[PDB]
Amino acid sequence: LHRFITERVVTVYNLSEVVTAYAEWYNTNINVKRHIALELSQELENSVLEKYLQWSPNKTRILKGCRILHKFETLQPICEPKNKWWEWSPNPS
Amino acid sequence: KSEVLNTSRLKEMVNPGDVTARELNQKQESFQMTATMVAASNYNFIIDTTDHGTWRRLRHYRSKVKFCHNPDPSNPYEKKEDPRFIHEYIMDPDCQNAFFSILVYFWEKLQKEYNGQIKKVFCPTIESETEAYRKSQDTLHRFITERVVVYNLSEVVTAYAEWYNTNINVKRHIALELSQELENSVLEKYLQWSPNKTRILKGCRILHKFETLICEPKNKWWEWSPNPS
Ligand SMILES: Nc1ncnc2c1ncn2[C@@H]1O[C@H](COP(=O)(O)OP(=O)(O)NP(=O)(O)O)[C@@H](O)[C@H]1O
């Protein structure tokens, strides 16, 4: 999740397209797996998105600062003992 | 992760019903089942039902604490975790005896106060957070409030299916039940009865991207508090 965050993102873009984008990114970058969008919302609130956190008129806590990407668009904004280590060394060891 | 309950294997369990299960090849005596049930998780419980039969034998609550070894102050919902409640404090006989005493005392209190009826006892935090969860987990209302403010009915069910998969998760639905719940939902001011013998709605908008329109004890809460408690 954080790899996708600080790999593809640097309007509010809603959130369904966001979850689908993360799903396809994970399928391509990592493995083909289905993600339940509610979970992705919870970890998105848990991830670094509070600065982008916003609200929608349809009663939807929404995001901001969104950078869309679907192709090659790129960025588009200690020590050692003498001879006895088993001697346990001093208290710091 | 979060899983759905599918409303099977639940009402039967919630109700104390005797059952001649087990002994598939043979036959195990019908045994009466009577056990208090508790379900907790770090994730969400997906529910898929609307019948009064369901949503009536259920109770919901949400915790408001968290224990950690770095107890940052200024947050009342955070305390220094004790890495000792688990590795010990369980095998000690005396603590178990004390807990058993607490349980028997509470059962005696319940029996002498509410005559054994757990439904009659009143908790405002409960039966309010529960109906708050009821306001959720009912995705049809969310779809209606998100996408619609005659288009027939196949379009409606397909729109609900695509919305659900996108908003929640790719899941399969049946058009008939969705329609009947639509006449069971807040659509009757729009829903009508066409002369072509096809129940349809009216004033239907299909949005695509953005189309606009109590008390505290002295020091002993186990004193049962006053009668309202
Ligand atoms: N009232 C309390 N005072 C102090 N420590 C507590 C208290 N209640 C719980 N703890 C500690 O906080 C932790 C409770 O977390 P807990 O819910 O058991 O974790 P979990 O996610 O369920 N799985 P696990 O971390 O293995 O226990 C344990 O380490 C307890 O010892």
XYZ file of N, CA, C and O and ligand atoms in Angstrom, chain B residues 42 65-68 79-86, ligand 1:
83
model
N -11.044 -7.789 15.037
C -10.399 -6.537 14.672
C -10.899 -6.002 13.340
O -10.551 -4.877 12.967
N -10.747 1.529 23.823
C -9.454 1.527 24.493
C -8.427 0.847 23.599
O -8.753 0.254 22.570
N -7.170 0.945 24.019
C -6.039 0.332 23.341
C -4.856 0.368 24.294
O -4.626 1.380 24.959
N -4.117 -0.735 24.361
C -3.008 -0.882 25.291
C -1.712 -1.063 24.514
O -1.634 -1.910 23.618
N -0.701 -0.265 24.858
C 0.582 -0.303 24.172
C 1.692 -0.001 25.169
O 1.459 0.583 26.230
N -3.490 3.267 27.120
C -2.884 2.967 28.409
C -1.653 2.097 28.213
O -1.513 1.392 27.211
N -0.758 2.157 29.194
C 0.417 1.298 29.200
C -0.009 -0.161 29.250
O -0.627 -0.602 30.224
N 0.313 -0.910 28.200
C -0.052 -2.317 28.168
C 0.750 -3.097 29.202
O 1.897 -2.769 29.514
N 0.122 -4.129 29.751
C 0.786 -4.987 30.721
C 1.137 -6.304 30.050
O 0.237 -7.118 29.787
N 2.411 -6.566 29.754
C 2.817 -7.849 29.165
C 2.874 -8.965 30.204
O 3.809 -9.769 30.232
N 1.865 -9.007 31.070
C 1.789 -9.999 32.133
C 0.403 -10.600 32.304
O 0.279 -11.630 32.975
N -0.640 -10.005 31.720
C -1.984 -10.567 31.778
C -2.100 -11.882 31.024
O -3.050 -12.635 31.263
N -1.170 -12.175 30.122
C -1.246 -13.341 29.253
C -0.288 -14.437 29.704
O -0.705 -15.563 29.976
N -6.636 -3.118 31.774
C -5.427 -3.419 31.294
N -4.339 -2.931 31.931
C -3.127 -3.229 31.454
N -2.803 -3.972 30.392
C -3.899 -4.439 29.781
C -5.214 -4.218 30.154
N -6.085 -4.860 29.288
C -5.290 -5.444 28.425
N -3.957 -5.234 28.662
C -2.836 -5.746 27.885
O -2.997 -5.317 26.546
C -2.944 -6.443 25.647
C -4.333 -6.751 25.153
O -4.291 -6.882 23.723
P -5.031 -8.070 22.998
O -6.421 -7.653 22.513
O -5.028 -9.237 23.910
O -4.160 -8.357 21.707
P -4.780 -9.181 20.544
O -4.848 -8.322 19.325
O -6.209 -9.646 20.948
N -3.816 -10.515 20.243
P -2.531 -10.519 21.341
O -1.659 -9.216 21.137
O -1.691 -11.734 21.121
O -3.103 -10.548 22.810
C -2.275 -7.558 26.442
O -0.859 -7.492 26.333
C -2.751 -7.277 27.868
O -1.809 -7.729 28.833
